[PDB]
Design a protein around this ligand. Structure first.
Ligand SMILES: NC[C@H]1O[C@@H](n2c(C#CCOC[C@H]3O[C@@H](n4cnc5c(N)ncnc54)[C@H](O)[C@@H]3O)nc3c(N)ncnc32)[C@H](O)[C@@H]1O
Ligand SMILES: NC[C@H]1O[C@@H](n2c(C#CCOC[C@H]3O[C@@H](n4cnc5c(N)ncnc54)[C@H](O)[C@@H]3O)nc3c(N)ncnc32)[C@H](O)[C@@H]1O
Ligand SMILES: NC[C@H]1O[C@@H](n2c(C#CCOC[C@H]3O[C@@H](n4cnc5c(N)ncnc54)[C@H](O)[C@@H]3O)nc3c(N)ncnc32)[C@H](O)[C@@H]1O
Ligand SMILES: NC[C@H]1O[C@@H](n2c(C#CCOC[C@H]3O[C@@H](n4cnc5c(N)ncnc54)[C@H](O)[C@@H]3O)nc3c(N)ncnc32)[C@H](O)[C@@H]1O
Lengths: 259, 259, 259, 259
């Protein structure tokens, strides 16, 4: 079937990619970076994030695989020594798929984005003020550095550094965390992270300034004349190729406690 | 149908209970505290917690209602002024039910318990050491004051004070938080709260001392010769009587931000 | 003696300022905004911060007074109703002085700055990497959103929202807090806030990018070709006019717990 | 001069102690565990804590030295390989002294205690309620698991696990941290850690139950009919023998970041 391989760009990743293409040539496997059914990322979690966004319009027709040439990643969880074994078991089709939920982001002035990790909103300097509306009722007026809405698999990333909980990716949900909120008699926020199920809509609305720094995964965009930022669990999902058991809590333990 | 009413025990709650019994007498409603189909708690969230444990063996056949004679509670979310309206709409059967997940706790020396809020494990003095095992693999060796496993509706209680996330109760899950863990080159814990889906089993195992203070909701028990404490989302659920929309995030906003 | 009054710029502050000038005209008090011995700020803590920086080159010859036309401030701790009483007791010289420590910031490419609240260092987009050196020995390699070095009186401001401790201003010290650090096997930071005595020097050194967003109190500057940012408790101090006992912990209680 | 050596009690510590006594016998050094001028602890920080409390009535006449037979300690900061060098430089008197502040604790029913690390107050089950009074004015009504008042050198211990700041021991101060406080419309606490200078008195006062678990360093005592617990920086100080530069921030880096 059609496949493609993206590389971090260093020597180790480029030549592991060239070796996998060589092994793939020994099978009924055609290299196509326009309509691949298999997308292989060689590098780190950042390389995988780029691969996901490179093919975000054909998610339902693509199985992703991540190979880490450096340390273990949460998406690049395959060791380079297993690269040759990846080729055969994947040419035969000896694999099922696991799917992780995604975060849908709507920005109105309208544009929509999908996030694999998180989407954040920050000020164009100093602190900013936004009204947080949950399912069309006002929840809080936030003043601080920013807010972060994370996918389940994204909770080990920016969300973790902001004090959020780590969620197993089988839970279809999204998590909101605060960035240095000021809490006093005037401004009052919940403080705790909030975990939302599907079909719940979190809306951020501007108060004074309407220019915000909006990020989706590794991409950071300055948006102007923004009227609303809406978050909800996407109906779409990213599909991974599964060849072996590597549980989420194992990857958490191996990444943060010790390998 | 058969009903019963428990009271906090103060003057205001006892006489609101006596007035509801009087109004119930004006309907085909029989008072029975052995096999009630409707359990009404008048007081606070603590009174409701007692009512839940008083009838935890007939959960599948009971609809709970909470009335707060003091401030708003997350379970006692009905105001005493609406007590008379509660009687009629509930004698007619003009209500459906909403169900919140529960936490199952197994203590082996074997005893099982259900928690509506959380279950905690603490030392018999100073810090304690337990091995945390997730789905039969060792995750961490915890040294500190204790651990807390919370239901979704329990996240606004002890879990919130421990830095956990607030989870909407439609998510069938459980959340684990740490109590003052010591983190150094020797002892290493994740720090972040952990949210587990159904069918995931978290096991706490003793290292040196085998005597622990184990709590389930408001009840605190000292347990000796404990070999294991296992947590997982229960197959059982608590059923509430629903007469009106009072969203979980509204109760969060009203309780912690302002009413 | 020579005095001056700065105003927030709203109607209430401008006309309280005009009334104080009128009352001052009834005394041997000359209005001079070039060499005042008394600087009165009418508005909020932000107005006071501007007044401090407006006269930061004559700190040793100026006594500051803060009046809050809105809610209570930590520097604007005088109520507008006591404005007329402020005039007389201050024309007579019936007051001593209290002094709060300041933070010295040296930026090398060299420029020096004084902060009454704090000084922060942030990235020009995403996370940044700086080496933290304490008294000429490498302490940690920080990767995250930023760092914040606070004065004692500044601990109730940005420092508080970052999890720092509240320090009584009689302690000559500075406090460093982290902004969403990533902690893993690669990058390791202390996490806890750090409190430094006098004569201790904290140096931030660039790793890759050398362009940082450096802030000192309300002013935020983008600095390029930065080689080092050094922090230490300043030898200079800000001097307040003291007419009455208003303890620091009282202002903390009144501001954050309830007035 | 008169000296004594305490041991953790394991094989390695007992025989390093026997070797140091042998080396001391080769000098004008008399072993006396009643009036020693030099107290040597061999083991861990816990062994040193016991040695400090064993001789807390002769602090002004004793210089302490800590040797760690396991990992590096903040008090046991001497490696066993340097034991023989410790003997000579210390028989000659080729050393000055450094002094760390201590915490004074007064319990009234009256008893006084000195803490090298911290003193904590906890409930006899569940949460407890105490009024916090700072310098004779009511600061907050705390409801939660407990409170912790730490010395500067104690901030790397229980205080660190509770979110407190790390303070250099040259600062004469004490730091208070909270243990899982409940914060709502009813109960309101500051949340942030509080750092107090000398001569400031923090008083904890009972509300309902008057039975508390009071700890001072490694000793935990249940106290009954307690009317008040008062904390302030002690006028006394512990004196260390100084043979070489080992800065506090180096010990922090070596203990928590990497050795
Ligand atoms: N394996 C570790 C390496 O992978 C990174 N990583 C990634 C990634 C990536 C590519 O860069 C952009 C990400 O920067 C993260 N980030 C930003 N600002 C951050 C901060 N202030 N604090 C922590 N994070 C921050 C956001 O989340 C962005 O999405 N995703 C994950 C994940 N899901 N889980 C665990 N690690 C993950 C991680 O950062 C490590 O570098
Ligand atoms: N409405 C507010 C009042 O109701 C209480 N409450 C309850 C309850 C109850 C009955 O007492 C036992 C509970 O004490 C909580 N708890 C213990 N130690 C705590 C601590 N150190 N810190 C915060 N909590 C603590 C645990 O969770 C126990 O289960 N349940 C909830 C809930 N689900 N959400 C919001 N509040 C709730 C709350 O405490 C208020 O008093
Ligand atoms: N009285 C309350 C009002 O006064 C403000 N205030 C000030 C001030 C001021 C003028 O603006 C710039 C300050 O913005 C603060 N800040 C920035 N980003 C922040 C964030 N993300 N989170 C919290 N803070 C933040 C930084 O500290 C800057 O210095 N100083 C203090 C103080 N010392 N103590 C208590 N409040 C103080 C406070 O912000 C309230 O508005
Ligand atoms: N070197 C590391 C070893 O030394 C210990 N240690 C000690 C000590 C000791 C002897 O035991 C009693 C101490 O238990 C600590 N403690 C209790 N409950 C704790 C918890 N829930 N969380 C973290 N702490 C806790 C309290 O503080 C008690 O005083 N003092 C210090 C110190 N000053 N700095 C750094 N480590 C120190 C540390 O615990 C390690 O074991």
């Amino acid at each position: 079937m059609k496949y493609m391989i993206t590389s971090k760009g260093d020597e180790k990743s480029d030549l592991l990619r060239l070796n996998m293409i060589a092994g793939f040539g020994e099978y009924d496997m055609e290299y196509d970076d326009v309509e691949p059914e298999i997308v292989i990322s060689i590098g780190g979690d950042g390389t995988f994030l780029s691969a996901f966004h490179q093919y975000e319009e054909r998610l339902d027709e693509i199985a992703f695989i991540g190979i880490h040439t450096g340390h273990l990643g949460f998406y690049a969880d395959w060791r380079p020594a297993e690269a040759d074994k990846l080729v055969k078991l994947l040419a035969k089709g000896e694999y099922q798929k696991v799917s992780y939920p995604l975060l849908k982001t709507t920005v109105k002035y309208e544009a929509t984005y999908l996030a694999l990790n998180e989407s954040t909103v920050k000020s164009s300097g100093g602190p900013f003020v936004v009204d947080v509306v949950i399912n069309d009722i006002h929840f809080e007026r936030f003043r601080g550095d920013g807010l972060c809405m994370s996918t389940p698999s994204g909770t080990t990333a920016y969300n973790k550094s902001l004090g959020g909980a780590l969620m197993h990716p089988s839970i279809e949900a999204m998590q909101l965390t605060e960035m240095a909120s000021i809490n006093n008699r005037v401004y009052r926020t919940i403080g705790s992270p909030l975990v939302f199920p599907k079909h719940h809509v979190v809306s951020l609305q501007p108060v004074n300034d309407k220019d915000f720094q909006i990020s989706v995964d590794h991409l950071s965009i300055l948006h102007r004349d923004v009227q609303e930022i809406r978050y909800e669990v996407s109906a779409k999902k990213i599909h991974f190729a599964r060849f072996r058991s590597f549980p989420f809590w194992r990857r958490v333990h191996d990444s943060f406690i010790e390998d």
